[PDB]
Design a protein around this ligand. Structure first.
Ligand SMILES: Nc1nc2c(ncn2[C@@H]2O[C@H](COP(=O)(O)OP(=O)(O)OP(=O)(O)O)[C@@H](O)[C@H]2O)c(=O)[nH]1
Ligand SMILES: Nc1nc2c(ncn2[C@@H]2O[C@H](COP(=O)(O)OP(=O)(O)O)[C@@H](O)[C@H]2O)c(=O)[nH]1
Ligand SMILES: Nc1nc2c(ncn2[C@@H]2O[C@H](COP(=O)(O)OP(=O)(O)O)[C@@H](O)[C@H]2O)c(=O)[nH]1
Ligand SMILES: [Mg+2]
Lengths: 438, 426, 136, 427
């Protein structure tokens, strides 16, 4: 029932911090790491087992490894409001980052810490009798979020092998450039993501920027809102191992239930009832409209709209108070709907699941008290049209052979640069070859 | 005197089977402590058929509880009546089946059919004179068609001649859940027709119309469909436990309805299903309990029996009834519908009665039908398969557990073998 | 009558009552005095009961004792006929349903509530006579 | 064992026909929940003409409830004796009829003639030996006159030899609700000159005059008027449920009034309708009913019987009355009034005497008369038709469901034949 969670770079460690407040608040456990003496939350028997291991004194401790070569984020979480919670040796720092360099993050400093991270992974794996998969958080646009990602997952896959790895990762947005060398720092790890990933969930920034602009009453938003939203979605994914409901699916079930071919595993996520507290109670948040507005292009989290490409597999994980005739009528309405076209080698196309624990919102938050929630995980073919953008961002910046001079000084040479590009050409070609109707 | 084994596998089968033993244990009158607190003395004299004695009087059930994951069986004991099952019958691995036919039937399958056959043949010896086997599973998953299709194939090859009950929830036509449904069906349709020789099989879609119109339910959950198919499997097994006038046992309910050896796929029913408020507005005589049974809509069917024929129908009555009014009411139902019953068979209807009405009603019945129109359910799965197989959709996970494409299209050749045989009698 | 399930949830979302419980069945042939925990969720008035086990007893490590459910008051109520447990009664089906003016097939099913549960009193859990001995 | 099934269509028919079941149920002693609490064993002896046993000693009526809007059926279940009905027999639509004959027949009720009949065809199998039906409607509206007309041609093509009955309000000349009442009525007589075997004519305008002069009510609401039709519509089924001394069932009257196959639009009546102040002052015998029975202001059709000729009169009496005294009073009111009864029918009156009276009345009676006066209702209808039709006033809603301009004139000449076929036999 257990799962191992790893947080890499700046962004993965931040969103993991968001996930960890949401899990501690989701169960009864304080930031002091102890279950409380007085308040009874009506918790499970041993239902914290997925993320927490219980020391005999009552202190519950997490399973997550926080690695960053620049020590600033880990040395502020070691002093922040969660200094008490973690294993103090679980958290690995250094003294120099990549400074937006795949090769500096993967070869110049990259050999120095992999024995530490692998030994910590074995040290986690030996107490947990159950094990289900890996949950890895990173951002492609950084050197220590792409190169160290690739290095750790290649060594971890040649250690373990047959187990699923789910990479909950941040992908770049057009017209905003936090870093200048985004394609050079992004396309290189794409070879080994296609070599061994199984659920590579890309999340955008400006899509959530706009969805909190218009669904919520937010003007001028920041990172913490985005991170708590993504943490809500990850708990909605993971809830079927912890809680129990009338129709529930584990991670090898939706791994074997959403992936058609071994080279098409890139789904897309959406959480439906996200709205402010003033507007929330002036509408009924019924199941039919909640799963109908879950199919809007403006309610998605990566800007490639579903209208261009046809769907092939959807999963709808529900939590709260849901009777199955409601969701069956909802599927029938969606199947009678016109604009949402499928692909003619799936007759069926969906998957549903039902759980009996409602959404739970952290105090001082942004979300409304809602009695139900759903989360869809779907794969379409518009992400190839969300990769042609980085193809033609790489091309016009390589046409001057610009700024590979920093890359040639570290370990890698120019030879891998063409291989990554022909790999992505093969990948978008295979999406077109799949998406053609036979 | 004649005792019966009921075997629970899958997520869908384990759950209905939890609702199965609540409709048995209240009609014989033993409460969830295991003590006997029934009313009549006719409940004890054949209590041994499903249940089993224990020291102190805690009557225990005869059921074996298999699931590859521990999630469901940590929720079956957590029910009201769930604290009766013998905890040497709870057998499990530790990983789920992944909604996969590959991880059920062959590879992880050998690691428990050693261990789940070793408790079953402990129940055969504790049984006195056995009769047959019951099994509750679903065709469209990984524990139901994975573990059960093994276990029926490995228990007739121990006991070669016994009757075999199998209660399979078939996948629904237009409203289903998983994308992997035409895989778990066509692989497991092959070993059923060769082995299991009576399947009582109608889906979740047709149970939703019975909820919406006949019972007029507003919000029917999963806890009422189980109560809708637990009653029709406790009235087919009623001439083995209760006295009557013209009573028929599970081999009497085979030779009447297997004309040709591979035509044994039935369709269930349960007669006095009414509304909620309209109890006081309804009369109950066998002239109109024979009318709720013999329609295509208010009987449990995701097919139209008007699009085919009836090959051999049985109907088991309960309660204190006539015998002319039963037998003339099967005369008047073949004459008015002679186009729908076949020729070349002089009598179509078997009829059995009994002398115990259920709890809360003065009479009840169960309409069990073998029909030529069942081939559309075996059509629509094999139409879902061919538009999905030929681009080789999911054939690396089945490759990932050693199973070849040579035995996928070979299983399509036997669904099409079987749809021809029911169609022989146009 | 109120069938609304929102104001109570908004008021009493994360407030659960807990009473430690004891069931003293040693009058059977092999029986023990058993220790239990009774939860009671004020969001919807449903009782979940757990199992607490000694150091090296022979009982199995199953998850709970009963599920989250609206516990009936006296004994086990009889298992009713299908279609009888509807919350709202219906005149006809014009699926769309038209509601009935009189509730004909509605049944008098009493339940446990927070004022029926108290410290130092004995109740009936599907026949099991227990005594609520403690509280937090 | 000679059963009748009740069908009640529209918003006037359901209000009329939910008052009929309160008249009948306390004639037979039964409670507002079908429980028998009567005080005569002959109350039960023929209850199965109109009822149907339910388990436990509760009786349910044989009624099918028809509407195109679902708001009236709540207003009937909310009534006093509403909860006795069959909940599976409540059948209705979603959206309105628009008060169009072109929408009950063609759009709104033509998607419902599978489900009204399956309730109907089930009710004619529970019987022992069926005799009749009865539709309860008016001839001014869409639901009552456009579904109650389609349903008749649904029954008779199935059950062509069972005797159908039909109770119908004819629209008044001067009392008006729609402006489109002649358009509704004239296209509905096209299927009652063909398909009914018994049809009645009741006018709201003459219903008001009885409540002003004879009953002397100050202001009559509908509830007393719908009560007035209930004790004559429960007069033609008196010989089926109680013993008689000269009895005539629902079939014996029909072959004996109607001389030629299209003359079957009868007038009702009720003899001892008395004012509340003049009950203490009144003698009640068999002669004085007849002077009130034939009395031209105690009959519910607004065309004067002195402006025509009678063809045949029935009179279904109730009480314990002498049988010479019945049959000489039906002679005496023919000899003193010779002109208004036709020639070539020597005895112009049929008679019938029962033995169980109404509730509280020691003796009563019920008139039914077939006169040649009824053409006046069939001339002021027909002139108001061509008053609007000759410049096509309100047609492009009926033309919205697409009837051309000949089907309002084809069904206009089928309405003027009753002007001909009554002056054919008047002189
Ligand atoms: N959720 C979240 N994502 C962030 C945040 N800051 C940056 N990102 C993402 O990270 C990308 C920038 O590169 P980083 O991931 O920060 O670089 P890195 O992986 O830490 O590697 P270094 O540059 O060597 O430190 C941006 O494109 C963002 O999408 C943040 O504060 N919160
Ligand atoms: N009646 C009933 N049906 C259920 C229940 N749980 C699941 N099902 C049905 O079982 C079908 C598939 O179950 P499945 O995942 O194949 O179980 P598995 O074989 O163990 O994998 C679904 O379509 C559900 O409709 C239940 O509790 N009651
Ligand atoms: N006797 C009687 N007549 C009524 C009652 N309610 C309405 N009416 C008459 O019904 C006539 C119109 O009904 P109609 O148009 O056929 O209703 P519709 O079928 O729904 O359109 C009016 O002229 C009223 O005089 C009632 O309760 N009793
Ligand atoms: Mg950094």
């Amino acid at each position: 029932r257990e799962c191992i969670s790893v947080h890499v770079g700046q962004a993965g460690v931040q969103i993991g911090n968001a996930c960890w407040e949401l899990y501690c608040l989701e169960h009864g456990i304080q930031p002091d790491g102890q279950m409380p003496s007085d308040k009874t939350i009506g918790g499970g028997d041993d239902s914290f087992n997925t993320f927490f291991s219980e020391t005999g004194a009552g202190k519950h401790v997490p399973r997550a490894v926080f690695v960053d070569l620049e020590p600033t984020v880990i040395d502020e979480v070691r002093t922040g409001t969660y200094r008490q919670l973690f294993h103090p040796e679980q958290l690995i720092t250094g003294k120099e980052d990549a400074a937006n360099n795949y090769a500096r993050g993967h070869y110049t400093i990259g050999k120095e810490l992999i024995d530490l991270v692998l030994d910590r992974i074995r040290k986690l794996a030996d107490q947990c009798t159950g094990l289900q998969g890996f949950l890895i958080f990173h951002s492609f646009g950084g050197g220590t979020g792409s190169g160290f990602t690739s290095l750790l997952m290649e060594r971890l896959s040649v250690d373990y092998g047959k187990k699923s790895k789910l990479e909950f990762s941040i992908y770049p947005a057009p017209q905003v450039s936090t870093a200048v060398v985004e394609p050079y720092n992004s396309i290189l790890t794409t070879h080994t993501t296609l070599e061994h990933s199984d659920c590579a969930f890309m999340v955008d920034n400006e899509a959530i920027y706009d969805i909190c602009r218009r669904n919520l009453d937010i003007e001028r938003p920041t990172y913490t809102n985005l991170n708590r939203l993504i943490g809500q979605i990850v708990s909605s994914i993971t809830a079927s191992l912890r809680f129990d409901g009338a129709l529930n699916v584990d991670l090898t079930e939706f791994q074997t239930n959403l992936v058609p071919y071994p080279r098409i595993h890139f789904p897309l996520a959406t959480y439906a009832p996200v709205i402010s507290a003033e507007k929330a109670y002036h509408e009924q948040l019924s199941v039919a409209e909640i799963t109908n507005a879950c199919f809007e292009p403006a309610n998605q989290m990566v800007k490639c709209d579903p209208r261009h490409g046809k769907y092939m597999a959807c999963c709808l994980l529900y939590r709260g108070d849901v009777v199955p005739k409601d969701v069956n009528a909802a599927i029938a309405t969606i199947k009678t709907k016109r604009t949402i076209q499928f692909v003619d080698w799936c007759p069926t196309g969906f998957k549903v699941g039902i759980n009996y624990q409602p959404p739970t919102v952290v105090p001082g938050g942004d979300l409304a008290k809602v009695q139900r929630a759903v989360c869809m995980l779907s794969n379409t073919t518009a992400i190839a049209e969300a990769w042609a953008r980085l193809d033609h961002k790489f091309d016009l910046m390589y046409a001057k052979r610009a700024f590979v001079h920093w890359y040639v000084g570290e370990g890698m040479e120019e030879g891998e640069f063409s291989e990554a590009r022909e790999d992505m050409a093969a990948l978008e070609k295979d999406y077109e070859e799949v998406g053609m109707d036979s | 005197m004649r005792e019966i084994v009921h075997l629970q596998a899958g997520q869908c089968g384990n759950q209905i089977g939890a609702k199965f033993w609540e409709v048995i244990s209240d009609e014989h009158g033993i409460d969830p402590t295991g003590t006997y607190h029934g009313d009549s003395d006719l409940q004890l004299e054949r209590i041994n058929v499903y249940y089993n004695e224990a020291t102190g009087g805690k009557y225990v059930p005869r059921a074996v509880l298999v699931d590859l994951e521990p999630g469901t069986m940590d929720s079956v004991r957590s029910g009201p009546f769930g604290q009766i099952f013998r905890p040497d019958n709870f057998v499990f691995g530790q990983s789920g089946a992944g909604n996969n036919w590959a991880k059920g039937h062959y590879t992880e399958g050998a690691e428990l059919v050693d261990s789940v056959l070793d408790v079953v043949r402990k129940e055969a010896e504790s049984c006195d004179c056995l009769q047959g086997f019951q099994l509750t599973h679903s065709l469209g998953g990984g524990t139901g068609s994975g573990m059960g299709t093994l276990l029926i194939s490995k228990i007739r090859e121990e006991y070669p001649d016994r009757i075999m009950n199998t209660f399979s929830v078939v996948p629904s036509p237009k409203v289903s859940d998983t994308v992997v449904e035409p895989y778990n069906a066509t692989l497991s349709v092959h070993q059923l027709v060769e082995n299991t020789d009576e399947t009582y099989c109608i889906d979740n879609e047709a149970l939703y119309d019975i909820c919406f119109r006949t019972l007029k339910l507003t919000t029917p959950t999963y806890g009422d469909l189980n109560h809708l198919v637990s009653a029709t499997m406790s009235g087919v097994t009623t001439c083995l436990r209760f006295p009557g006038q013209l009573n028929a046992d599970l081999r009497k309910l085979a030779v009447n309805m297997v004309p040709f050896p591979r035509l044994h796929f039935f369709m269930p029913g349960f007669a006095p299903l009414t509304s909620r408020g309209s109890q006081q507005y309804r009369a109950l005589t066998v002239p109109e309990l024979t009318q709720q049974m013999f329609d295509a809509k208010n009987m449990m069917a995701a097919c139209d029996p008007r699009h085919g024929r009836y090959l051999t129908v049985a109907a088991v009555f309960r309660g204190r009834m006539s015998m002319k009014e039963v037998d003339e009411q099967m005369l008047n139902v073949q004459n008015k519908n002679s186009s729908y019953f076949v020729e070349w068979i002089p009598n179509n209807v078997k009829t059995a009665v009994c002398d115990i009405p259920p709890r809360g009603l003065k009479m009840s019945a169960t309409f069990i039908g073998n029909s030529t129109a069942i081939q559309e359910l075996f059509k629509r799965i094999s139409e879902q398969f061919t538009a999905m197989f030929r681009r080789k959709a999911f054939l690396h996970w089945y490759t990932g557990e050693g199973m070849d494409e040579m035995e996928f299209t070979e299983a399509e050749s036997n669904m099409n073998d079987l749809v021809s045989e029911y169609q022989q009698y146009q | 009558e109120s069938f609304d399930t929102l104001k109570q949830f908004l008021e009493y979302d994360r407030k659960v009552l807990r009473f430690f419980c004891v069931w003293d069945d040693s009058g059977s042939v092999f029986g023990d005095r058993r220790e239990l925990i009774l939860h009671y969720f004020l969001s919807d008035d449903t009782i979940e009961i757990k199992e607490v086990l000694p150091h090296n007893s022979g009982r199995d490590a199953m998850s709970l004792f009963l599920q989250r459910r609206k516990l009936p008051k006296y004994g086990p109520p009889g298992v009713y006929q299908p279609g009888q447990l509807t919350d709202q009664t219906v005149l006809n089906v014009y699926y769309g349903f038209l509601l009935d003016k009189y509730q004909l097939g509605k049944l008098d099913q009493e339940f446990y509530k927070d004022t029926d549960l108290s410290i130092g009193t004995t109740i009936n859990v599907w026949g099991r006579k227990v005594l609520l001995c403690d509280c937090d």
